[PDB]
Amino acid sequence: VVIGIVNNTVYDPLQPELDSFKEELDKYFKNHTSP
Amino acid sequence: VVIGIVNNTVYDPLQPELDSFKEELDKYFKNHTSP
Amino acid sequence: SGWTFGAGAALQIPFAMQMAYRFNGIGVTQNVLYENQKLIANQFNSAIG
Ligand SMILES: *[C@@H]1O[C@H](CO)[C@@H](O[C@@H]2O[C@H](CO)[C@@H](O[C@@H]3O[C@H](CO)[C@@H](O)[C@H](O)[C@@H]3O)[C@H](O)[C@H]2NC(C)=O)[C@H](O)[C@H]1NC(C)=O
Ligand SMILES: *[C@@H]1O[C@H](CO)[C@@H](O[C@@H]2O[C@H](CO)[C@@H](O)[C@H](O)[C@H]2NC(C)=O)[C@H](O)[C@H]1NC(C)=O
Ligand SMILES: *[C@@H]1O[C@H](CO)[C@@H](O)[C@H](O)[C@H]1NC(C)=O
Ligand SMILES: *[C@@H]1O[C@H](CO)[C@@H](O)[C@H](O)[C@H]1NC(C)=O
């Protein structure tokens, strides 16, 4: 509805910090599924 | 560059999000990895 | 005391930090003052001279 708007990506101060634990939790799942 | 700065710690609201859950998940992980 | 001595009891406050209030009221964040603290003194001192 607003005119003059543009596309870009809004950075999230939560997901990469949360994905850092996803980097730990999912790795822990792979740390237990594979053996 | 800032003059007069002093050392201290800042308590993130995300800190309890990882304190009360990740250890709980680690408790679940120990509930899962140990057996 | 900044400007609080006009409204009630005078309250002491460092001058190097008072400009953060004045800059905040202008519409400029406080971070520009401390990061330019050395420079902003030279402009003020030269101007008053
Ligand atoms: C706040 O804490 C930080 C770190 O927790 C302090 O920074 C550290 O300050 C010490 C000085 O006591 C620095 O040691 C110096 O190391 C250089 C070599 O890099 C050496 O030539 C000096 O003689 C001295 O030993 C230390 O490097 C520095 N840390 C870092 C990462 O640079 C800071 O001083 C603390 N500030 C206050 C007000 O408590
Ligand atoms: C901003 O991006 C969106 C999607 O990336 C664009 O929406 C698409 O616009 C095209 C027209 O060229 C449509 O055919 C698509 O159906 C639209 N996508 C969706 C999901 O509806 C939008 O046009 C872009 N806007 C600007 C100003 O670049
Ligand atoms: C994977 O699980 C084991 C438990 O058997 C643990 O000792 C190890 O630290 C885990 N891996 C990582 C990267 O933490
Ligand atoms: C441990 O896991 C089992 C099944 O996975 C569950 O029944 C039990 O409640 C869990 N223990 C704790 C303390 O969560």
Curated annotation (Swiss-Prot), chains A, B:
**Which gene produces this protein?**
S
Recite the lineage of the species.
Answer: Viruses, Riboviria, Orthornavirae, Pisuviricota, Pisoniviricetes
Q: What does this protein do?
A: Subunit of the fusion protein that is processed upon entry into the host cell. Mediates fusion of the virion and cellular membranes by functioning as a class I viral fusion protein. Contains a viral fusion peptide that is unmasked after S2 cleavage. This cleavage can occur at the cell membrane by host TMPRSS2 or during endocytosis by host CSTL. In either case, this triggers an extensive and irreversible conformational change that leads to fusion of the viral envelope with the cellular cytoplasmic membrane, releasing viral genomic RNA into the host cell cytoplasm.
Q: Can you tell me which residues are glycosylated?
A: 7, 31
Instruction: State the source organism's domain of life.
Output: Viruses
Name used for this protein in its record = Spike protein S2'
